Amino acid sequence: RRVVRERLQALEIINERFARQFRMGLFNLLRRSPDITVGAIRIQPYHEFARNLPVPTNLNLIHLKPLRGTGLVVFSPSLVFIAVDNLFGGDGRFPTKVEGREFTHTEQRVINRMLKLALEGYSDAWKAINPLEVEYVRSEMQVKFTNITTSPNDIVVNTPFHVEIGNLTGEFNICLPFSMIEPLRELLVNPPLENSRHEDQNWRDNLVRQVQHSELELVANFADIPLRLSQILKLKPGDVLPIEKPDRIIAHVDGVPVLTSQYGTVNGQYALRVEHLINPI
Amino acid sequence: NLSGTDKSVILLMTIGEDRAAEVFKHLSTREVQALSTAMANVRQISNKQLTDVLSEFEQEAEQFAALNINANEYLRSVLVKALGEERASSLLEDILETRDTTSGIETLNFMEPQSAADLIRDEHPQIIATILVHLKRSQAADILALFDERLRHDVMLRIATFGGVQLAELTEVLNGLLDGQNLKRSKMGGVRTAAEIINLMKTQQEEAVITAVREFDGELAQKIIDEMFLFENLVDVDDRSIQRLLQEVDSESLLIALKGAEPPLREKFLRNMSQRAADILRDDLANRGPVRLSQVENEQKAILLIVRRLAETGEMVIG
Amino acid sequence: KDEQLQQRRANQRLGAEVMSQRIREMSDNDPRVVALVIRQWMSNDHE
Amino acid sequence: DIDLIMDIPVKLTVELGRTRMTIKELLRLTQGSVVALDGLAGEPLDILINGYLIAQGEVVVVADKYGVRITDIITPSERMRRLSR
Amino acid sequence: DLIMDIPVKLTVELGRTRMTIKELLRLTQGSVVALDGLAGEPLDILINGYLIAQGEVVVVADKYGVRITDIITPSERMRRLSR
Amino acid sequence: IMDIPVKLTVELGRTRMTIKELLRLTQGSVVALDGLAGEPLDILINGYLIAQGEVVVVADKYGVRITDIITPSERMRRLSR
């Protein structure tokens, strides 16, 4: 049994701007403008993501301090082949497919350049909103060896991307554990907010100035006696129910108490004599 | 006589410890290790030898009138004040890499083609195509020849597609492949050293080994037997080499070897000789009686050792 | 005989060490005449 | 079905009065401040459970012990009239 | 029944465990604690803290729905309170 | 300071209606609550709340994945609900 649901707003924009940054980075790196198509953000268990992962492919570990845990990135063999031949200027119209064969030293080095470029791009994109350092840990071949999540059923978030350069195409993914963003679960849901300048706080203070003009309905309580509905049914008008001594009156609005008070007889009216505001701090 | 290495080694001791360390930094670690072993194993200079190495170094110094400093820093500093440090460091790195990549190109041309091909077999076909283009056309062909048909065809197809002529990354590619050679070593892995041991072993023992490896892998056994092939038939070794053996080996030993040889072997070893020599050899073979096979095998082994020595000298090919 | 050979060895060593000091001083005052002769040394070694 | 439910504990609540009041007023309020309520002195207090209207009653001091004496059971029509305010 | 239309508060629980405060003291904010009831047993269903019946949750219509199975059964209620 | 065992309590959701809606529903009738799939669960002691935390199952035995002590801020709102 493992269930999680949520809706996200900010990381979509974050992925879009990071994708634009990565596109321009690859353009300047390979002297050719690429195109990146960000897929819909995927929320799935770790085992489902591993099953959907096309083996063989290279997986890389990038830690995210100070949050405990390591991030994961993947790149397709088609993408690495196309990138490396473009680095050599090859047209790519006579491609080759390698399966099971581990990446050579040179191929791993080219993967290292893609890894560092992507790390820098995501670092700047993420720090544009929240400063969270990204540091590569260890590349991996098989997903089972990555074993990032505690359980295969652990639900993780993955961001797919479709990257092409002219006729040449490709797809790579960025998948993250949900526990990685569990402390920031409320922040990622919230859409990005601009300003935050000094006039933004007094703007909040302006809202407060509006807030003082508010309407509040208090509730006064005397007795909260536990009884039985059988007794209620046998209760008849004229019946009397004893009540303990109400040494004080609790005042609450929609439930939340604010103060304690003492009842009193004032100008022929049921009046209360407040003692002090309830401060939970 | 003193070898060129020993003279250089003695000069390396004489030039001083700091200069020797600087030369070690300027030179290859294999050279550093060789010099260290030489100065540890035994000194290379005697009083006549020290005189000779010092005198020849002096004649080198007379001719090498440097009137100049190495200035790996001083030359740059004079350049930096006039134009600025920046517009020199990158261009200098590019020039050095061009010297370095050409050095690697020449090294790959010199080193064995199939070894280069297998070192690059795992690498990218674009890498293979660009390195083939950069290499000498004899060397490029030699790396291409070994490759399987599909990889080779893709390589020639991508030769045309290579229009990017990329430039710093190519040098770094050469650097990456360069760092893998010092770990490769090998030598022990190759079959021919193992095959030579099989020849060295006792007849029945390598016959049993041949049967066992035929059970293990018929193709491997056939390859090792093809490596075995040494004057077991006329076509592989050729009549000229058959003539060469008979004029270089004792007639009595040749006849004793031919006692246990096949009649086609006798025919091939008698065609080259003239009528008189062939008649003498045939009469001697007919007259000589049976001999214990140990001596025949020993003389055959000596004859095959002579054949191997001739092949090593490289007068003619065998196979 | 043996004493004469020993004295010859001693004076040869003295001459060798002073002339080696001559190499030391010329190499100190001019490194260019050193690198090219090192190149010649390695050429002789590999040849 | 009915017999099953009868022996079940339930809670009840009673309210004194209601006044419009804003956070300015409550912040201005201090220790010992007196606040009245729309409930007239001597008016029977409304009786509810879990915020649901039940009846009305008044407190009577019987044997120097406080006790609320109910007076009526709210009809559906009068409950609708009360909520339609 | 003139008070039929009265909303009520229900309570559904998993299981109990006799747990001394020394245990919670070493229990961190991210610790794991077990219970007494075995997995798969229907959860007990109560209202306003009063025992009613038992049921089990099922993933139906994308919402946790509990399937009522037993009745108050006052004899069984007495047996349960007699523990 | 001195130690003593104490009764805990975990609550799976709360709703508001009359029992007759479920009293009419005989045994085997499935009924949902405000409790959905994914949200954490709270822990009560003697009926007094402590902390928020999910519950998992291990070795065919339930295990609470407690998260943090409930502060009065959210305590008040859950009391109001």
Author numbering:
A (entry chain M): 44 to 324
B (entry chain G): 3 to 168, 172 to 324
C (entry chain F): 514 to 560
D (entry chain N): 53 to 137
E (entry chain P): 55 to 137
F (entry chain Q): 57 to 137
From the paper:
Rotation is driven by a flagellar motor, which is a supercomplex containing multiple rings. The C-ring (C = cytoplasmic), which contains multiple copies of protein subunits called FliG, FliM and FliN, switches the rotation of the flagellum between counterclockwise (CCW) and clockwise (CW). The switch also connects to the MS-ring (MS = membrane–supramembrane), which transmits both the direction and the speed of rotation to the flagellar rod.
To inform on this pose, we determined the 4.6 Å resolution structure of switch particles containing the extreme CW-biased FliGΔPAA mutation. Symmetry expansion followed by local refinement gave superior results to particle subtraction. FliGD3–FliMmid undergoes smaller positional changes, rotating approximately 25° as a unit with a slight adjustment in the binding interface. Comparison of the CCW and CW poses suggests a mechanism for switching in the switchΔPAA mutant. It also moves FliGD2 to eliminate a domain swap. Removing this interaction allows FliM to rotate.
